[PDB]
Amino acid sequence: QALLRILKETEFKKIKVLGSGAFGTVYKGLWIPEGEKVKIPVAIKELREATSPKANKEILDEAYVMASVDNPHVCRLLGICLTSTVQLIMQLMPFGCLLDYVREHKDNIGSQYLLNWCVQIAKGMNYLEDRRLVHRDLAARNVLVKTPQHVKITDFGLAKLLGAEEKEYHAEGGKVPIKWMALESILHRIYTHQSDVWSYGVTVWELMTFGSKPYDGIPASEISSILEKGERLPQPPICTIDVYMIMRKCWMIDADSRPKFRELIIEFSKMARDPQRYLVIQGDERMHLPSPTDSNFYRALMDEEDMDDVVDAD
Amino acid sequence: QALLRILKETEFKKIKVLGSGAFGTVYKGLWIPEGEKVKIPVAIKELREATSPKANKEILDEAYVMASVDNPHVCRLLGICLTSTVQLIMQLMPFGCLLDYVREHKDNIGSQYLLNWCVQIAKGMNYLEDRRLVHRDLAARNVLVKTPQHVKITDFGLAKLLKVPIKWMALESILHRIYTHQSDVWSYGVTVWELMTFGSKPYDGIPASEISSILEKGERLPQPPICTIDVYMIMRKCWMIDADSRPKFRELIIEFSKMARDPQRYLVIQGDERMHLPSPTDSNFYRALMDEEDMDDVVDAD
Ligand SMILES: *CCC(=O)Nc1ccc(OC)c(Nc2cc(-c3[nH]c(SCCOC)nc3-c3ccc(F)cc3)ccn2)c1
Ligand SMILES: *CCC(=O)Nc1ccc(OC)c(Nc2cc(-c3[nH]c(SCCOC)nc3-c3ccc(F)cc3)ccn2)c1
Ligand SMILES: [Cl-]
Ligand SMILES: [Cl-]
């Protein structure tokens, strides 16, 4: 109720485009509180139109759910503007998304960061599962960096809200994330918490390869066939067999043989307590988590919300 | 202590002057974390030359104390840059200071905000008193607006670290340069008077050289147009000659909180039905966007 603010077009302005995805276009924006003269930075997403003529009441009902999430590793929807088109407002994250972050910092990222990101994403997804919410598009592009030590999931439930034309399930690298999807989602549009776990495994692979594209060069139309033949994403060079095995379990054909997010939290938390045993990165001792001084400073400036302590090495 | 980050000159940049005061110039700045590509707004105060220069070790010791304050209504010093000058770094407050805010909103501020600001300032000062820290320069200009519903005291400790606010000062501070928690209570009374007059200058048109004589005669700032006598008697007790006759900050929290529960009974403002606190919807939006720290609940009406 009081969790989702209904904005008028007169009280916010899109300022500079930041990029787009299958769900819409994202802008850095400014919120102007009524009667005030300050301009408050916000992130605004102008959504693509839904594949069906959904009642506005169901868009609002779905947005109320998105505004109801309360977890340090899930981005809460803060506001909505409904005109002819739908616009979503949330907190702006200046560090951008984790996919861009690992690509741009590939030679500066140590094992402690990689393993803690895996923990935090699993915690966010476990919260979504506890709320009975299936994400449907978990990917590194949909994990946002609040600080380098604090990541948060976004864009959950948008695939279910906006839908996708079935032509896109057979197009070449279109709006349907075929190469992140469980086989049962590709074949029968079956979406469950356990198919989210499949996408979690692909997300981890993106991180451990510092943002490589999964199944690069393979047509989207052939993915279901190569998956049925038992082919999977390769072992990243920095991953020990323990880490790769977790990823491989995420991609089992039988969905209920895959790990659960609550188990993934525990296993990645265990590895983070001895990070150099599970990931092999040249120069890893240069790339520790921030000092208490730097962490205190980061949190006071940019990240005052509560969060579980990161897992340090033993 | 890990509460104070010492910054290099090369990792931040001043981009605009926001204002100035007796202690230095305030800039909006951008913090550039090393190896990152983001620029994070900050507020930077470059201090002027101290009257008698202090040893670097002593500047650091006082900075560590300033970084040690942990209360929702006191601004914590976050970092320092010690070179040929002293530059203090804190979180930027885009709403600015409360003095400018009440002046800009002279025709739009409701009684619930005014009384709640009095509560929050008293809570911050009570915290400083518990830490045995004297502010020495409490004034509406040194109260910052994080959101309209959440204000915070700033500039603690600068006065002794380093153009004298005679019209905010207790008589014993004017006469004998004595500064205590009870002389902070005097300045709190002047600060409340500033808020309730929507930012009027105290003793306007009266030379500062005459203030101590006027106080000794028993004259004080007048009852603000909107204040019932309940509120004005609190102010007058703040300005008693006997420092131990003045109220305690702990008591001021209780009294203003009681009044904030029935605000239109204690402040009489034209069209007060115009204005009021944000709904839970607008408060959740403000908090999630720019005020995620833990804070005591607002005092709402009946
Ligand atoms: C992975 C690509 C990306 O997000 N880059 C990026 C670059 C610069 C930024 O700020 C300086 C941000 N900050 C940000 C982004 C989002 C967000 N990102 C996406 S992915 C599609 C293309 O985005 C560029 N969607 C959102 C979003 C979801 C819901 C909503 F209500 C608003 C935006 C959110 C917050 N901050 C990212
Ligand atoms: C009452 C005058 C005022 O503060 N105006 C003002 C205008 C615009 C702002 O941001 C857009 C801010 N924000 C702010 C100010 C300060 C701060 N204010 C002062 S009072 C002297 C005049 O300053 C403008 N001192 C400070 C300060 C103290 C310590 C430090 F380390 C940095 C700054 C702090 C944060 N945000 C204010
Ligand atoms: Cl998108
Ligand atoms: Cl100043």
Side-chain angles (χ1 to χ4, degrees), chain A residues 30-31 33 36-41 301 304, chain B residues 16 18 26 28 41-43 75 90-98 100-101 104-105 144-148 150 152 286 289-291:
Chain A
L30 294 172
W31 170 54
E36 307 286 357
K37 314 274 190 273
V38 300
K39 314 162 192 212
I40 306 296
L301 269 185
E304 306 192 76
Chain B
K16 182 208 261 170
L18 301 176
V26 177
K28 178 167 181 166
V42 296
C75 291
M90 286 185 348
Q91 194 179 39
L92 175 63
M93 306 284 214
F95 277 100
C97 73
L98 191 50
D100 295 351
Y101 188 90
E104 300 174 301
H105 294 86
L144 304 183
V145 180
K146 189 177 186 180
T147 75
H150 181 182
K152 302 171 67 152
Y286 260 117
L289 261 187
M290 58 193 299
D291 186 8

mmCIF file of all heavy atoms in Angstrom, chain A residues 30-31 33 36-41 301 304, chain B residues 16 18 26 28 41-43 75 90-98 100-101 104-105 144-148 150 152 286 289-291:
data_model
loop_
_atom_site.group_PDB
_atom_site.id
_atom_site.type_symbol
_atom_site.label_atom_id
_atom_site.label_comp_id
_atom_site.label_asym_id
_atom_site.label_seq_id
_atom_site.Cartn_x
_atom_site.Cartn_y
_atom_site.Cartn_z
ATOM 1 N N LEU A 30 15.615 12.660 -12.293
ATOM 2 C CA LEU A 30 15.583 13.569 -11.161
ATOM 3 C C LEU A 30 14.170 13.604 -10.619
ATOM 4 O O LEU A 30 13.217 13.825 -11.372
ATOM 5 C CB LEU A 30 16.034 14.976 -11.557
ATOM 6 C CG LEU A 30 17.489 15.155 -11.981
ATOM 7 C CD1 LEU A 30 17.689 16.571 -12.519
ATOM 8 C CD2 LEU A 30 18.442 14.860 -10.820
ATOM 9 N N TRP A 31 14.032 13.375 -9.324
ATOM 10 C CA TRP A 31 12.754 13.507 -8.653
ATOM 11 C C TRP A 31 12.704 14.882 -8.006
ATOM 12 O O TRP A 31 13.645 15.276 -7.312
ATOM 13 C CB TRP A 31 12.564 12.400 -7.616
ATOM 14 C CG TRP A 31 11.387 12.620 -6.743
ATOM 15 C CD1 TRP A 31 10.104 12.850 -7.140
ATOM 16 C CD2 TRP A 31 11.378 12.642 -5.314
ATOM 17 N NE1 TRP A 31 9.294 13.010 -6.043
ATOM 18 C CE2 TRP A 31 10.053 12.882 -4.909
ATOM 19 C CE3 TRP A 31 12.362 12.472 -4.336
ATOM 20 C CZ2 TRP A 31 9.689 12.979 -3.568
ATOM 21 C CZ3 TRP A 31 11.996 12.557 -3.007
ATOM 22 C CH2 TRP A 31 10.673 12.813 -2.638
ATOM 23 N N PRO A 33 10.585 16.807 -5.403
ATOM 24 C CA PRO A 33 9.487 16.741 -4.437
ATOM 25 C C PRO A 33 8.607 17.971 -4.564
ATOM 26 O O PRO A 33 9.097 19.086 -4.758
ATOM 27 C CB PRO A 33 10.200 16.693 -3.083
ATOM 28 C CG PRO A 33 11.581 16.242 -3.395
ATOM 29 C CD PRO A 33 11.899 16.797 -4.746
ATOM 30 N N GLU A 36 9.321 21.602 -3.093
ATOM 31 C CA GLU A 36 10.745 21.748 -2.826
ATOM 32 C C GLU A 36 11.468 22.162 -4.099
ATOM 33 O O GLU A 36 10.912 22.118 -5.201
ATOM 34 C CB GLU A 36 11.335 20.442 -2.276
ATOM 35 C CG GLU A 36 10.607 19.885 -1.081
ATOM 36 C CD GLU A 36 10.873 20.671 0.195
ATOM 37 O OE1 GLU A 36 11.676 21.628 0.164
ATOM 38 O OE2 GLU A 36 10.275 20.323 1.227
ATOM 39 N N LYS A 37 12.725 22.564 -3.936
ATOM 40 C CA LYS A 37 13.547 22.972 -5.065
ATOM 41 C C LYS A 37 14.737 22.053 -5.299
ATOM 42 O O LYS A 37 15.496 22.278 -6.247
ATOM 43 C CB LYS A 37 14.030 24.421 -4.872
ATOM 44 C CG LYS A 37 12.923 25.378 -4.431
ATOM 45 C CD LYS A 37 12.155 25.935 -5.624
ATOM 46 C CE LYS A 37 11.225 27.067 -5.208
ATOM 47 N NZ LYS A 37 9.893 26.571 -4.753
ATOM 48 N N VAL A 38 14.919 21.020 -4.475
ATOM 49 C CA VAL A 38 15.998 20.068 -4.702
ATOM 50 C C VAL A 38 15.623 19.117 -5.837
ATOM 51 O O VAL A 38 14.449 18.869 -6.129
ATOM 52 C CB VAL A 38 16.335 19.289 -3.417
ATOM 53 C CG1 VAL A 38 16.781 20.237 -2.314
ATOM 54 C CG2 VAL A 38 15.133 18.462 -2.982
ATOM 55 N N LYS A 39 16.646 18.572 -6.485
ATOM 56 C CA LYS A 39 16.480 17.558 -7.522
ATOM 57 C C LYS A 39 17.230 16.312 -7.080
ATOM 58 O O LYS A 39 18.455 16.343 -6.930
ATOM 59 C CB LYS A 39 16.993 18.058 -8.872
ATOM 60 C CG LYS A 39 16.522 19.461 -9.221
ATOM 61 C CD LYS A 39 17.381 20.078 -10.316
ATOM 62 C CE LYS A 39 17.101 21.565 -10.470
ATOM 63 N NZ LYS A 39 17.264 22.020 -11.876
ATOM 64 N N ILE A 40 16.498 15.226 -6.876
ATOM 65 C CA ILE A 40 17.024 14.012 -6.255
ATOM 66 C C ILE A 40 17.282 12.983 -7.351
ATOM 67 O O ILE A 40 16.335 12.598 -8.050
ATOM 68 C CB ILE A 40 16.048 13.456 -5.210
ATOM 69 C CG1 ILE A 40 15.674 14.535 -4.184
ATOM 70 C CG2 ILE A 40 16.629 12.224 -4.540
ATOM 71 C CD1 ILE A 40 16.843 15.014 -3.355
ATOM 72 N N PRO A 41 18.512 12.490 -7.510
ATOM 73 C CA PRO A 41 18.775 11.485 -8.546
ATOM 74 C C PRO A 41 17.977 10.213 -8.299
ATOM 75 O O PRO A 41 17.855 9.743 -7.166
ATOM 76 C CB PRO A 41 20.283 11.233 -8.424
ATOM 77 C CG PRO A 41 20.821 12.428 -7.717
ATOM 78 C CD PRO A 41 19.736 12.873 -6.789
ATOM 79 N N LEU A 301 28.728 7.053 3.280
ATOM 80 C CA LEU A 301 28.455 7.908 2.131
ATOM 81 C C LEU A 301 27.346 7.352 1.249
ATOM 82 O O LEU A 301 26.513 8.112 0.742
ATOM 83 C CB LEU A 301 29.718 8.079 1.296
ATOM 84 C CG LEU A 301 30.622 9.255 1.613
ATOM 85 C CD1 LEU A 301 31.758 9.308 0.587
ATOM 86 C CD2 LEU A 301 29.802 10.516 1.580
ATOM 87 N N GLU A 304 23.840 3.099 3.714
ATOM 88 C CA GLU A 304 23.470 3.143 5.123
ATOM 89 C C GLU A 304 22.498 2.046 5.538
ATOM 90 O O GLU A 304 22.227 1.913 6.737
ATOM 91 C CB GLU A 304 22.859 4.505 5.465
ATOM 92 C CG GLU A 304 23.719 5.688 5.083
ATOM 93 C CD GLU A 304 23.206 6.982 5.689
ATOM 94 O OE1 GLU A 304 23.412 7.203 6.906
ATOM 95 O OE2 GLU A 304 22.576 7.765 4.949
ATOM 96 N N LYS B 16 31.861 23.108 -6.593
ATOM 97 C CA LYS B 16 30.984 24.262 -6.446
ATOM 98 C C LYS B 16 31.000 24.719 -4.998
ATOM 99 O O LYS B 16 30.998 23.895 -4.085
ATOM 100 C CB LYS B 16 29.546 23.928 -6.875
ATOM 101 C CG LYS B 16 28.575 25.094 -6.786
ATOM 102 C CD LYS B 16 27.152 24.611 -6.536
ATOM 103 C CE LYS B 16 26.346 24.570 -7.828
ATOM 104 N NZ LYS B 16 25.037 23.881 -7.653
ATOM 105 N N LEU B 18 29.116 26.000 -1.864
ATOM 106 C CA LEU B 18 27.766 25.969 -1.308
ATOM 107 C C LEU B 18 27.512 27.080 -0.306
ATOM 108 O O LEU B 18 26.350 27.436 -0.071
ATOM 109 C CB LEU B 18 27.498 24.624 -0.613
ATOM 110 C CG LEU B 18 27.619 23.375 -1.482
ATOM 111 C CD1 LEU B 18 27.427 22.084 -0.648
ATOM 112 C CD2 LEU B 18 26.633 23.445 -2.652
ATOM 113 N N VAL B 26 32.453 25.926 2.413
ATOM 114 C CA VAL B 26 31.866 24.612 2.168
ATOM 115 C C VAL B 26 31.698 24.423 0.669
ATOM 116 O O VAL B 26 31.156 25.295 -0.021
ATOM 117 C CB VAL B 26 30.519 24.446 2.891
ATOM 118 C CG1 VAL B 26 29.900 23.085 2.563
ATOM 119 C CG2 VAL B 26 30.719 24.574 4.361
ATOM 120 N N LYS B 28 30.443 21.600 -2.439
ATOM 121 C CA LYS B 28 30.055 20.315 -2.992
ATOM 122 C C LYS B 28 31.269 19.735 -3.702
ATOM 123 O O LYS B 28 31.933 20.428 -4.475
ATOM 124 C CB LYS B 28 28.879 20.472 -3.955
ATOM 125 C CG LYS B 28 28.433 19.187 -4.634
ATOM 126 C CD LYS B 28 27.084 19.399 -5.308
ATOM 127 C CE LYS B 28 26.576 18.138 -5.987
ATOM 128 N NZ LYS B 28 25.131 18.273 -6.334
ATOM 129 N N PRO B 41 29.054 12.340 -4.813
ATOM 130 C CA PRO B 41 28.923 13.636 -4.129
ATOM 131 C C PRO B 41 29.322 13.556 -2.665
ATOM 132 O O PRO B 41 29.043 12.575 -1.972
ATOM 133 C CB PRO B 41 27.435 13.967 -4.281
ATOM 134 C CG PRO B 41 27.042 13.280 -5.551
ATOM 135 C CD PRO B 41 27.858 12.009 -5.609
ATOM 136 N N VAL B 42 30.005 14.605 -2.207
ATOM 137 C CA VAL B 42 30.345 14.804 -0.801
ATOM 138 C C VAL B 42 30.252 16.297 -0.516
ATOM 139 O O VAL B 42 30.176 17.122 -1.428
ATOM 140 C CB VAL B 42 31.760 14.296 -0.436
ATOM 141 C CG1 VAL B 42 31.878 12.777 -0.602
ATOM 142 C CG2 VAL B 42 32.809 15.011 -1.268
ATOM 143 N N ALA B 43 30.269 16.638 0.767
ATOM 144 C CA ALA B 43 30.438 18.009 1.222
ATOM 145 C C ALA B 43 31.827 18.157 1.825
ATOM 146 O O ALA B 43 32.284 17.291 2.576
ATOM 147 C CB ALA B 43 29.378 18.401 2.255
ATOM 148 N N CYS B 75 25.689 15.091 12.687
ATOM 149 C CA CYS B 75 26.497 14.735 11.526
ATOM 150 C C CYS B 75 27.848 14.197 11.971
ATOM 151 O O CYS B 75 28.550 14.831 12.763
ATOM 152 C CB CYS B 75 26.691 15.951 10.622
ATOM 153 S SG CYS B 75 25.171 16.481 9.800
ATOM 154 N N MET B 90 32.190 15.140 4.668
ATOM 155 C CA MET B 90 30.978 14.554 5.218
ATOM 156 C C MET B 90 30.025 14.221 4.089
ATOM 157 O O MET B 90 30.225 14.605 2.932
ATOM 158 C CB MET B 90 30.259 15.497 6.186
ATOM 159 C CG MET B 90 30.910 15.642 7.528
ATOM 160 S SD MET B 90 29.870 16.668 8.598
ATOM 161 C CE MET B 90 28.684 17.340 7.442
ATOM 162 N N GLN B 91 28.966 13.497 4.446
ATOM 163 C CA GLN B 91 27.878 13.252 3.515
ATOM 164 C C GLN B 91 27.234 14.573 3.119
ATOM 165 O O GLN B 91 27.048 15.463 3.956
ATOM 166 C CB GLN B 91 26.845 12.323 4.166
ATOM 167 C CG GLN B 91 25.833 11.713 3.226
ATOM 168 C CD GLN B 91 24.864 10.790 3.954
ATOM 169 O OE1 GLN B 91 24.433 11.078 5.078
ATOM 170 N NE2 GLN B 91 24.529 9.668 3.323
ATOM 171 N N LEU B 92 26.899 14.700 1.839
ATOM 172 C CA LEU B 92 26.268 15.912 1.323
ATOM 173 C C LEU B 92 24.777 15.924 1.643
ATOM 174 O O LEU B 92 24.082 14.927 1.435
ATOM 175 C CB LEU B 92 26.471 16.014 -0.189
ATOM 176 C CG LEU B 92 25.752 17.183 -0.866
ATOM 177 C CD1 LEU B 92 26.316 18.489 -0.325
ATOM 178 C CD2 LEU B 92 25.875 17.125 -2.368
ATOM 179 N N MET B 93 24.274 17.066 2.124
ATOM 180 C CA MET B 93 22.853 17.227 2.434
ATOM 181 C C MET B 93 22.205 18.127 1.390
ATOM 182 O O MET B 93 22.247 19.361 1.520
ATOM 183 C CB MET B 93 22.673 17.814 3.835
ATOM 184 C CG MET B 93 23.381 17.059 4.927
ATOM 185 S SD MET B 93 22.529 15.535 5.376
ATOM 186 C CE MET B 93 22.916 15.503 7.110
ATOM 187 N N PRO B 94 21.600 17.569 0.330
ATOM 188 C CA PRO B 94 21.099 18.423 -0.763
ATOM 189 C C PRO B 94 20.016 19.405 -0.349
ATOM 190 O O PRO B 94 19.838 20.418 -1.038
ATOM 191 C CB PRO B 94 20.565 17.412 -1.791
ATOM 192 C CG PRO B 94 20.380 16.149 -1.025
ATOM 193 C CD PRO B 94 21.442 16.140 0.013
ATOM 194 N N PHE B 95 19.286 19.146 0.737
ATOM 195 C CA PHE B 95 18.294 20.118 1.193
ATOM 196 C C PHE B 95 18.920 21.344 1.850
ATOM 197 O O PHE B 95 18.219 22.343 2.032
ATOM 198 C CB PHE B 95 17.303 19.466 2.168
ATOM 199 C CG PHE B 95 16.183 18.735 1.489
ATOM 200 C CD1 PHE B 95 16.225 17.358 1.344
ATOM 201 C CD2 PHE B 95 15.098 19.425 0.974
ATOM 202 C CE1 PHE B 95 15.199 16.682 0.700
ATOM 203 C CE2 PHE B 95 14.072 18.758 0.340
ATOM 204 C CZ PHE B 95 14.120 17.384 0.204
ATOM 205 N N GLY B 96 20.204 21.302 2.210
ATOM 206 C CA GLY B 96 20.847 22.460 2.801
ATOM 207 C C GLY B 96 20.586 22.565 4.294
ATOM 208 O O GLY B 96 20.172 21.606 4.949
ATOM 209 N N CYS B 97 20.817 23.761 4.834
ATOM 210 C CA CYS B 97 20.686 24.009 6.263
ATOM 211 C C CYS B 97 19.270 24.458 6.651
ATOM 212 O O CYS B 97 18.507 25.000 5.841
ATOM 213 C CB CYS B 97 21.718 25.042 6.709
ATOM 214 S SG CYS B 97 21.309 26.701 6.152
ATOM 215 N N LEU B 98 18.930 24.227 7.926
ATOM 216 C CA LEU B 98 17.560 24.473 8.380
ATOM 217 C C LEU B 98 17.220 25.961 8.381
ATOM 218 O O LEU B 98 16.060 26.333 8.168
ATOM 219 C CB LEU B 98 17.352 23.870 9.775
ATOM 220 C CG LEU B 98 15.927 23.780 10.332
ATOM 221 C CD1 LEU B 98 14.963 23.156 9.340
ATOM 222 C CD2 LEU B 98 15.920 23.007 11.654
ATOM 223 N N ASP B 100 18.149 28.298 6.145
ATOM 224 C CA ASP B 100 17.690 28.637 4.802
ATOM 225 C C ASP B 100 16.359 27.980 4.492
ATOM 226 O O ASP B 100 15.531 28.557 3.783
ATOM 227 C CB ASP B 100 18.727 28.218 3.760
ATOM 228 C CG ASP B 100 20.023 28.988 3.887
ATOM 229 O OD1 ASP B 100 20.069 29.964 4.667
ATOM 230 O OD2 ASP B 100 20.998 28.598 3.211
ATOM 231 N N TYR B 101 16.135 26.768 5.009
ATOM 232 C CA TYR B 101 14.922 26.022 4.679
ATOM 233 C C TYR B 101 13.678 26.700 5.248
ATOM 234 O O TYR B 101 12.667 26.842 4.552
ATOM 235 C CB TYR B 101 15.034 24.581 5.189
ATOM 236 C CG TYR B 101 13.910 23.673 4.735
ATOM 237 C CD1 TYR B 101 14.006 22.936 3.553
ATOM 238 C CD2 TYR B 101 12.749 23.555 5.490
ATOM 239 C CE1 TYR B 101 12.968 22.107 3.141
ATOM 240 C CE2 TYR B 101 11.721 22.739 5.093
ATOM 241 C CZ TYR B 101 11.823 22.020 3.919
ATOM 242 O OH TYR B 101 10.772 21.211 3.545
ATOM 243 N N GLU B 104 12.991 29.863 3.226
ATOM 244 C CA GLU B 104 12.396 29.566 1.926
ATOM 245 C C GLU B 104 10.949 29.111 2.063
ATOM 246 O O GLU B 104 10.104 29.451 1.228
ATOM 247 C CB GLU B 104 13.220 28.505 1.191
ATOM 248 C CG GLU B 104 14.655 28.924 0.933
ATOM 249 C CD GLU B 104 15.503 27.812 0.335
ATOM 250 O OE1 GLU B 104 15.635 26.743 0.974
ATOM 251 O OE2 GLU B 104 16.042 28.012 -0.776
ATOM 252 N N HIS B 105 10.639 28.343 3.105
ATOM 253 C CA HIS B 105 9.286 27.852 3.328
ATOM 254 C C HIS B 105 8.542 28.651 4.390
ATOM 255 O O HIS B 105 7.722 28.089 5.123
ATOM 256 C CB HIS B 105 9.318 26.375 3.712
ATOM 257 C CG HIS B 105 9.803 25.479 2.619
ATOM 258 N ND1 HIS B 105 11.141 25.220 2.406
ATOM 259 C CD2 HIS B 105 9.129 24.773 1.680
ATOM 260 C CE1 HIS B 105 11.270 24.395 1.383
ATOM 261 N NE2 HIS B 105 10.064 24.106 0.925
ATOM 262 N N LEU B 144 21.388 20.835 9.732
ATOM 263 C CA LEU B 144 21.257 20.470 8.326
ATOM 264 C C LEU B 144 20.014 19.614 8.114
ATOM 265 O O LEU B 144 19.618 18.844 8.985
ATOM 266 C CB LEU B 144 22.488 19.711 7.830
ATOM 267 C CG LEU B 144 23.818 20.430 8.006
ATOM 268 C CD1 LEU B 144 24.933 19.579 7.397
ATOM 269 C CD2 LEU B 144 23.772 21.838 7.390
ATOM 270 N N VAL B 145 19.405 19.761 6.943
ATOM 271 C CA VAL B 145 18.197 19.039 6.564
ATOM 272 C C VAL B 145 18.613 17.858 5.689
ATOM 273 O O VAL B 145 19.040 18.051 4.547
ATOM 274 C CB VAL B 145 17.218 19.959 5.823
ATOM 275 C CG1 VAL B 145 15.965 19.208 5.435
ATOM 276 C CG2 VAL B 145 16.882 21.204 6.676
ATOM 277 N N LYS B 146 18.500 16.629 6.210
ATOM 278 C CA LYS B 146 18.746 15.461 5.366
ATOM 279 C C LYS B 146 17.521 15.141 4.514
ATOM 280 O O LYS B 146 17.638 14.881 3.311
ATOM 281 C CB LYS B 146 19.134 14.251 6.227
ATOM 282 C CG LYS B 146 19.623 13.064 5.390
ATOM 283 C CD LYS B 146 20.075 11.914 6.268
ATOM 284 C CE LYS B 146 20.688 10.793 5.426
ATOM 285 N NZ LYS B 146 21.109 9.678 6.313
ATOM 286 N N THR B 147 16.352 15.117 5.140
ATOM 287 C CA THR B 147 15.046 15.194 4.507
ATOM 288 C C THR B 147 14.256 16.186 5.348
ATOM 289 O O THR B 147 14.657 16.493 6.475
ATOM 290 C CB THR B 147 14.315 13.839 4.446
ATOM 291 O OG1 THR B 147 13.814 13.499 5.744
ATOM 292 C CG2 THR B 147 15.228 12.716 3.951
ATOM 293 N N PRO B 148 13.150 16.728 4.826
ATOM 294 C CA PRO B 148 12.354 17.656 5.648
ATOM 295 C C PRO B 148 11.936 17.066 6.987
ATOM 296 O O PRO B 148 11.690 17.826 7.927
ATOM 297 C CB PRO B 148 11.140 17.962 4.761
ATOM 298 C CG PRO B 148 11.611 17.717 3.381
ATOM 299 C CD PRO B 148 12.575 16.569 3.476
ATOM 300 N N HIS B 150 13.897 15.000 8.851
ATOM 301 C CA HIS B 150 15.066 14.449 9.535
ATOM 302 C C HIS B 150 16.188 15.476 9.456
ATOM 303 O O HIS B 150 16.756 15.686 8.380
ATOM 304 C CB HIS B 150 15.481 13.114 8.897
ATOM 305 C CG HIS B 150 16.669 12.458 9.543
ATOM 306 N ND1 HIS B 150 17.206 11.276 9.076
ATOM 307 C CD2 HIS B 150 17.416 12.808 10.617
ATOM 308 C CE1 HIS B 150 18.238 10.933 9.826
ATOM 309 N NE2 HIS B 150 18.390 11.849 10.765
ATOM 310 N N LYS B 152 19.844 17.232 11.383
ATOM 311 C CA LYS B 152 21.049 16.746 12.041
ATOM 312 C C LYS B 152 21.942 17.936 12.341
ATOM 313 O O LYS B 152 22.083 18.840 11.514
ATOM 314 C CB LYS B 152 21.804 15.715 11.169
ATOM 315 C CG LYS B 152 20.974 14.485 10.771
ATOM 316 C CD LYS B 152 21.668 13.593 9.728
ATOM 317 C CE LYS B 152 22.904 12.948 10.300
ATOM 318 N NZ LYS B 152 23.191 11.649 9.633
ATOM 319 N N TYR B 286 10.976 8.738 0.681
ATOM 320 C CA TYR B 286 12.120 9.547 1.094
ATOM 321 C C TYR B 286 13.220 8.686 1.696
ATOM 322 O O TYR B 286 14.403 8.864 1.380
ATOM 323 C CB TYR B 286 11.681 10.597 2.119
ATOM 324 C CG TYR B 286 11.467 11.987 1.576
ATOM 325 C CD1 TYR B 286 10.211 12.578 1.625
ATOM 326 C CD2 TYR B 286 12.519 12.720 1.039
ATOM 327 C CE1 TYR B 286 10.004 13.866 1.150
ATOM 328 C CE2 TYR B 286 12.320 14.002 0.551
ATOM 329 C CZ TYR B 286 11.062 14.569 0.614
ATOM 330 O OH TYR B 286 10.865 15.844 0.138
ATOM 331 N N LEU B 289 15.142 6.334 -0.814
ATOM 332 C CA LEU B 289 15.924 7.043 -1.820
ATOM 333 C C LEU B 289 17.163 7.698 -1.238
ATOM 334 O O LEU B 289 18.238 7.634 -1.847
ATOM 335 C CB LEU B 289 15.078 8.116 -2.499
ATOM 336 C CG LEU B 289 14.461 7.816 -3.857
ATOM 337 C CD1 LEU B 289 13.819 9.092 -4.404
ATOM 338 C CD2 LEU B 289 15.519 7.247 -4.806
ATOM 339 N N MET B 290 17.040 8.356 -0.083
ATOM 340 C CA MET B 290 18.150 9.168 0.399
ATOM 341 C C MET B 290 18.331 9.162 1.916
ATOM 342 O O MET B 290 19.120 9.966 2.426
ATOM 343 C CB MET B 290 17.973 10.614 -0.087
ATOM 344 C CG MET B 290 16.661 11.246 0.374
ATOM 345 S SD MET B 290 16.226 12.800 -0.455
ATOM 346 C CE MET B 290 17.622 13.846 -0.013
ATOM 347 N N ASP B 291 17.644 8.290 2.666
ATOM 348 C CA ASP B 291 17.806 8.344 4.123
ATOM 349 C C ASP B 291 17.566 6.938 4.681
ATOM 350 O O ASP B 291 16.537 6.642 5.296
ATOM 351 C CB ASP B 291 16.863 9.369 4.755
ATOM 352 C CG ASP B 291 17.113 9.566 6.251
ATOM 353 O OD1 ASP B 291 18.099 9.028 6.785
ATOM 354 O OD2 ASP B 291 16.302 10.262 6.894
#
